[PDB]
Write a protein that binds this ligand. Structure first.
Ligand code: PTI
Ligand code: PTI
Lengths: 231, 231
């Protein structure tokens, strides 16, 4: 876990990658009446299941407490669905690849009230990824950081156990930071460029947190998540 | 601007620091009827004015477009008020130093509906700052990063001007990253520790974004901000 090598962390995360699901939409039926929200909703609910399997495979995650594992996913679930959406949409300018059979552009967002706001923020993030030429290895590191970071400041506890957990989460996270830098070092970037790029990458996560928040508004999960985790 | 030296960036930001305002509350009147929200509201509205002066003094900020300057403050205003609150509350465990004459603890939050949620998140952030032993120089760098970063992904424009602006904002931001590292290098931290600490610092900003979002819910600003900026 905390002994994992940089290259081993990347092989470990890359291997943990979830599958790219398809939208359960009837291709022969008129789209102008498919219920946009309904499609996205059913899609996300199915990815959530695979998200758990993925999370269980992120180094150090299963070491935590079941209830801590739930808390973290409960805080990050939507941010992870989003950063994943933005990634696969990276090479699709002006469009969002929700699923191989569900590629929507701006206008298609004006379907539901206030959904075009969220699409634009997503497209913009996708665009930034294009601008930075984000790499698949950098991507998985970021998605793992989101998972371990998003809920680590809201355990609201100072018990010895919560203290060892928080400690352990920031130790894995540090490992991921080291890994990100390693990648950038190998790409040829100087020390300065490594720091600057690391910062540019982490700061985009603030934007993903914000999008998630807007998404939560437009949109118990704990028990649902629990049952999936506790196998 | 983009030529500023590390030590010059810190002297520049430290000098730009706003004043620590007081709550306009009658000390001889019973507090159980002072209207908690009213106090906080009037306080923030006054700090906002000083926030503009401060922003105008952040290197590279005034170089932007007035409308870009407004957009950035409109996106970050509450996050900045919050990171400032958390900072001055750092040495006050279990309490929030909203102002020298307004130090409130947990329970005092149960005043308004759902306000104790926000206080707890704030206390937790303050606690993390204590855990990391954040330094005044690191603090100002972070507050400047928030200002330039929070709204840089939502300009929703690809005009040449918007492209040069975004470019220019990420160039100042990189300067601040270099500065943060410089500080950590001088503190004695190794290269590895520098990277890890930079990451831990930036990631807390995601949490500040989240708190701001919750704060915006519980809670035009553009025109208001405009008038203050355009002097
Ligand atoms: O990979 C995916 C799949 C779907 C989505 C994204 C990524 C990001 C943007 N997004 C969204 C979020 C809010 C408003 C509009 C769109 C959709 C989305 C996300 C979540 C969602 O949830 C429906 C409720 N559902 C109930 C069971 C537990 C899981 C959540 C419904 C749609
Ligand atoms: O330095 C300060 C001063 C006040 C506050 C913070 C920091 C952070 C937490 N916080 C808050 C935010 C939402 C809910 C509860 C508390 C208060 C706060 C923040 C903003 C606020 O705004 C009232 C509306 N006001 C109208 C004019 C433009 C500026 C905004 C009222 C209270």
């Amino acid at each position: 876990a905390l002994s994992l090598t940089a290259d081993q962390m990347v092989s470990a995360l890359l291997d943990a990658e979830p599958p790219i699901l398809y939208s359960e939409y009837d291709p022969t039926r008129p789209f102008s009446e498919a219920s946009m929200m309904g499609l996205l909703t059913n899609l996300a609910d199915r990815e959530l299941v695979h998200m758990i399997n993925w999370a269980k495979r992120v180094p150090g995650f299963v070491d935590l407490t079941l209830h801590d594992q739930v808390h973290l996913l409960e805080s990050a679930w939507l941010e992870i669905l989003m950063i994943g959406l933005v990634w696969r949409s990276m090479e699709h300018p002006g469009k969002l690849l929700f699923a191989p059979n569900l590629l929507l552009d701006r206008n298609q967002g004006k379907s539901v009230e206030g959904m075009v706001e969220i699409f634009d923020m997503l497209l913009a993030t996708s665009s930034r990824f294009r601008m930075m030429n984000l790499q698949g290895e950098e991507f998985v590191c970021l998605k793992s950081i989101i998972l371990l970071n998003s809920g680590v400041y809201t355990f609201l506890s100072s018990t010895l156990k919560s203290l060892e957990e928080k400690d352990h989460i920031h130790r894995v996270l540090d490992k991921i930071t080291d890994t990100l830098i390693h990648l950038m070092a190998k790409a040829g970037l100087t020390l300065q460029q490594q720091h600057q790029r690391l910062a540019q990458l982490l700061l985009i996560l603030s934007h993903i947190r914000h999008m998630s928040n807007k998404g939560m508004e437009h949109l118990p999960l704990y028990d649902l998540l629990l049952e999936m985790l506790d196998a």
